[PDB]
């Protein structure tokens, strides 16, 4: 919690006795919480390394036409489009499977390009708001993954070589800034990666239909009448 009495003094003026005694509590709590957080991070990193160490690049191209749709930008009612913040983590460093239609004949990208910064800027200037890219999820590689579906290598900047073991690199990349997650936090990451039924379970819609809300006392009741004619 937060104590109702704060530490009003600055460390230039010098804290009083009680201000110092109260600050020490939080200081030591933070030290101990970091001591536990680093261990949890190490455990998760080890589990990821073990679950992903059979994932290496084993061929040049999956040749699959499947992919994942990435959102490059969304637009206001005004002509100005807002740049999607995920471009660096979702769109950048990918290879696309379907060329940008651009609403005209102009195909702004060839199938399999690097999608570097100039490609992203050219797609944003043309007015294309969504793209489809090759994804490691939709690869049909028999063993491991393919270089073209994976994307460029972050370190080298070029297309990933074959011998690269992207599984361990991915586990390290995910687990290295693990000691920075503070309190919905790192336990949430563990709950997701361990495929656990969440603490607070919010159900989803089972089928398209018309909803019916029933408000009782501390207990709701939602009933959806489906379109297929079933129960």
């Amino acid at each position: 919690e937060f104590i109702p009495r704060p530490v009003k003094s600055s460390f230039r003026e010098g804290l009083t006795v009680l201000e110092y005694f109260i600050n020490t509590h939080g200081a030591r709590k933070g030290l101990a919480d970091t001591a536990l957080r680093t261990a949890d991070s190490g455990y998760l990193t080890r589990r990821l390394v073990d679950v992903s160490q059979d994932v290496i690049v084993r061929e040049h191209d999956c040749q699959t036409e499947r992919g994942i749709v990435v959102e490059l930008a969304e637009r206001a009612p005004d002509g100005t489009l807002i740049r999607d913040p995920y471009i660096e983590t979702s769109a950048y460093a990918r290879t696309l499977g379907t060329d940008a239609v651009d609403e005209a004949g102009n195909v702004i990208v060839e199938r399999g390009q690097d999608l570097g910064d100039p490609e992203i800027d050219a797609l944003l200037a043309a007015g294309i708001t969504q793209v489809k890219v090759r994804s490691v999820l939709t690869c049909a590689t028999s063993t491991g993954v393919c270089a073209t579906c994976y994307g460029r290598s972050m370190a080298t900047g070029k297309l990933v070589d074959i011998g690269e073991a992207v599984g361990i690199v991915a586990a390290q990349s995910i687990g290295e800034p693990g000691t920075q997650l503070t309190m919905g936090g790192l336990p949430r990451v563990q709950e997701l990666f361990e495929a656990r039924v969440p603490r607070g379970k919010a159900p989803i819609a089972d089928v398209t239909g018309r909803v019916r809300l029933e408000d009782g006392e501390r207990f709701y009741k939602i009933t959806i009448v489906p379109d297929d004619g079933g129960e």
Binding site: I68, V136, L137, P177, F193, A195
Partner: protein, 156 residues
């Protein structure tokens, strides 16, 4: 998974994990989380054993399921599953990797009962036995390169 299909659960999990790592303000590209998620959907549950020797409810590889279906359709109710990284690591084909990872006693008992023979082709397996790992410079196409000067340079 059971409502919207696996290609949607992959997006959901990647989005949630990246949502946490962005709430803390960390630049992690989605491809790493996708590489991790890909291994959580590599198995399927058998509802009806059918003509194969799979036990129902047991988790078998998807490619293995399809390939052994082709062998028995030449002479089968599979449902995609989402399992945790621990349960996926313990379900590997190499008993040595599973024994070195976690829960050694149980893994060893189960492997002895089923008389498991480890194919001995994995990163951790080759590490344990002291063999060149099957990655990087250990891949066959890289490790068996032949090198000799050209004749034009051999003359000089």
């Amino acid at each position: 998974l059971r409502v919207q299909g696996p290609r949607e659960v992959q997006i959901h999990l990647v989005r949630e994990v990246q949502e946490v790592y962005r709430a803390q303000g960390v630049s992690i590209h989605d491809k790493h989380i996708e590489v991790i998620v890909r291994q959580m959907l590599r198995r399927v549950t058998i509802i009806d054993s059918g003509s194969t020797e799979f036990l129902p409810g047991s988790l078998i590889d998807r490619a293995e399921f399809e390939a052994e279906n082709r062998r028995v359709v030449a002479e089968a109710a599979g449902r995609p599953v989402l399992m945790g990284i621990t349960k996926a690591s313990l379900a590997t084909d190499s008993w040595l990797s599973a024994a070195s990872f976690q829960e050694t006693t149980r893994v060893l008992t189960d492997a002895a009962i089923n008389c498991r023979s480890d194919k001995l082709n994995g990163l951790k397996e080759n590490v344990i036995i002291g063999k060149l790992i099957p990655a990087g410079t250990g891949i066959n196409r890289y490790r068996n390169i032949a090198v000799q000067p050209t004749e034009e340079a051999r003359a000089a």
